[PDB]
Amino acid sequence: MAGFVQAPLSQQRWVGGSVELHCEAVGSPVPEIQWWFEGQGPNDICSQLWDGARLDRVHIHATYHQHAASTISIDTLVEEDTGTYECRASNDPDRNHLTRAPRVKWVRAQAVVLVLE
Amino acid sequence: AGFVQAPLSQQRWVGGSVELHCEAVGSPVPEIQWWFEGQGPNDICSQLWDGARLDRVHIHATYHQHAASTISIDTLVEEDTGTYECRASNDPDRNHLTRAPRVKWVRAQAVVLVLE
């Protein structure tokens, strides 16, 4: 099982500024962390972020020594960076690949980031 | 509304007890709720309440400056296994007053595994 020892923090930021969200988890084995995101307005859905996203303004750095630590950073914010950011952790051996596996459940921890002019 | 402490996943024995804690901030001070989803594809997240599961589930919360909430479960059974989720919000329409714009609470999860 994976468990959170630090959740990301909701916060108010400015267009052209920047944001940094942090997430930490424990388990044995040491769990994996991903970051997920969902904009505002009931047309946006929860999908995975990746290192280099949004024209290379999104950066994700992770370490896995004894526990999982992950920092997501975003350069030069724009209003549409507004939304909910979700850290997910799991040490389930099947979480990746494809498998006809049912399971596949990660623990989630959300922060909301609001970007204002 | 955001978390400054997420609940922490825990493994326990049948017949034992568990306790999960949740800290959240915002102005105004956000409300905390606990929600739960058992294992297997046929379960959903539903709100837990104080006294649930034949008065084995107790929920205590305070809201001075910070939102602090604790869920406790006595005499654990196997079907207590699953994902517990702390939800927080200070949105004034929170109590889904039929007022049907949004509904979005911030969420932080912990898993609880109860082994025989």
CA distance B107 to B87: 5
Cβ pair A108, B37 in contact under 8 A = no
Instruction: Report which of B33, B6, B42 is spatially closest to residue B89, judged by C-alpha positions.
Output: B33
How far is the alpha carbon of B85 from chain A, nearest alpha carbon, in Å?
Answer: 9
Cβ of A106: how many Cβ atoms within 10 Å? 22
Cβ of B27: how many Cβ atoms within 10 Å? 8
How far is the alpha carbon of B107 from chain A, nearest alpha carbon, in Å?
Answer: 5
CA angle, A11 as apex, B34 and B103 as ends, to 5°?
45
* Contact: B3, A7; criterion CB under 8 Å: yes
Q: How many helices (H) and strands (E) does chain B have?
A: 1, 9
Cβ pair B97, B33 in contact under 8 A = no
Resolution (A): 2.3
From chain A, the residues in CB contact with B26 under 8 A are 10
CATH code of B21's domain: 2.60.40.10
CA distance A25 to B44: 24
Q: Give the one of A1, A84, A102 whose C-beta lies nearest to B9's C-beta.
A: A1
Pairs of residues, one from chain A and one from chain B, whose beta carbons lie less than 8 Å apart: 66
CA distance B8 to A107: 10
Q: Are strands A11-14 and A107-116 parallel, antiparallel or unpaired?
A: parallel
> Which residues from A are below 8 Å from B when comparing CB atoms?
1-11, 27, 84, 102, 105, 107-112
Distances from the Cα of B98 to the Cα of B45, B81, B101, angstroms: 20, 33, 9
Give the technique used to solve this structure. X-ray
CA distance A58 to A71: 11
- Number of folded domains that form chain B: 1
Cβ pair B8, B22 in contact under 8 A = no
Structure tokens of B68? 């602090």
Supply the DSSP string of A43-112, one letter for each residue.
T---EE--TTHHHHTEEEEEEEESEEEEEEEE-S--GGG-EEEEEEEE--TTSSS--S-S--PPEEEEEE
From chain A, the residues in CB contact with B107 under 8 A are 108-110
What H or E segment, with its residue span, contains residue A20? strand A19-26
Q: Give the one of B11, B111, B113 whose C-beta lies nearest to A107's C-beta.
A: B111
* Contact: A107, B9; criterion CB under 8 Å: yes
Q: Give the one of A1, A105, A110 whose C-beta lies nearest to B108's C-beta.
A: A110
Give the structural domain span for B115. Answer: 1-116
Give me the residue label for tokens 């959740």: A7
